[PDB]
Design a protein around this motif. Sequence first.
Motif, short mmCIF file in Angstrom:
data_model
loop_
_atom_site.label_atom_id
_atom_site.label_comp_id
_atom_site.label_asym_id
_atom_site.label_seq_id
_atom_site.Cartn_x
_atom_site.Cartn_y
_atom_site.Cartn_z
N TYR A 44 22.03 41.93 71.82
CA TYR A 44 20.93 42.80 71.43
C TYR A 44 19.59 42.19 71.81
CZ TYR A 44 21.50 40.14 66.98
OH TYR A 44 21.68 39.17 66.02
N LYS A 55 31.03 46.12 68.06
CA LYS A 55 29.87 46.21 68.94
C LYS A 55 30.27 46.22 70.42
CE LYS A 55 26.60 42.85 69.15
NZ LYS A 55 25.93 43.08 70.47
N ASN A 67 17.21 47.79 74.57
CA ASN A 67 18.19 47.01 73.83
C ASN A 67 19.55 47.52 74.30
OD1 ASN A 67 19.83 45.71 71.86
ND2 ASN A 67 19.69 47.55 70.58
N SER A 98 22.47 46.45 73.65
CA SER A 98 23.54 46.35 72.67
C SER A 98 23.78 47.72 72.03
CB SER A 98 23.17 45.32 71.60
OG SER A 98 24.01 45.42 70.48
#
Length: 336
Positions: free
Chosen positions: A187, A182, A229, A231
């Motif tokens: 997130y 990631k 978001n 993330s």
Amino acid sequence: SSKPTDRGQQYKDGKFTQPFSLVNQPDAVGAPINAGDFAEQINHIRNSSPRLYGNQSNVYNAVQEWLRAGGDTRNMRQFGIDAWQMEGADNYGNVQFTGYYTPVIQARHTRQGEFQYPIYRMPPKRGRLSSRAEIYAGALSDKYILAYSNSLMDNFIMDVQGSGYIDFGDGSPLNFFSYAGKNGHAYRSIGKVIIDRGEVKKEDMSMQAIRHWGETHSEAEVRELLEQNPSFVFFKPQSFAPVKGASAVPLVGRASVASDRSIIPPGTTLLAEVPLLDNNGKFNGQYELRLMVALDVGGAIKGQHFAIYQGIGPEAGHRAGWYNHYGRVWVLKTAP
């Protein structure tokens, strides 16, 4: 008297007042037409859930013996198979059948047409610093692109799930991609956003709700929303992983269903007259006799209702889309 027949409903077995009614012999002619698929489905249970297999092999074995011997519903008794007809939602034996499938991400190897939304593999540390918005704007080098998808929203669903299947359309086998890593940003809930905006009702929020919202909106609108978001998820190629249901058993198309665990436990064998549909998605008065096994569950799948797993990909999705019809179902059990 109000007895509609537009959705496959039939009324030739009288009225039922018990959830399950033992019949002398099922009111169904011929043999199931999916014997092969059923055999494949049982094998998957034997290999993936030996504990469930050992609890239902009495039924599977009896049914298999019956099928090899001819499979005629008039000859089930000699194999010790009892057929229990379900009352249906209308108490006339009309059971509700919906459809469901495993969505696939359509993709290409190069940017073209609608395929402009890249899926990435793990970039080096520095590259992992970028937020979603920044990656969308071209922060990462093209060398880390695994595929160009035709849906930004589908890419996000995949991010949440952690994996997905990609279909490059070149006839090659489906490619499975699993979680690799990631970016460095926490997130934020996309569901929360469409709730605080009055786009979706708090009680209606699901992954399908978000998925549907992306289909009925512009990519510009989807991008704006998705960027909330920061993330971002990275993936890696992985050897194919067959789709499994809540019973952790690989599902076989139209040989497995999602059911209400309260009235139809996992592993339960079903003999059903399934209503046949055409390209338009309309019932033509024809039925299919199939054998299926309850191997999944659902939130909106309760009572005299079954969701037939249609398989994986667009074709399965078409069948799973226009399916909300009625048929007859008999639970098969061995005489105690």
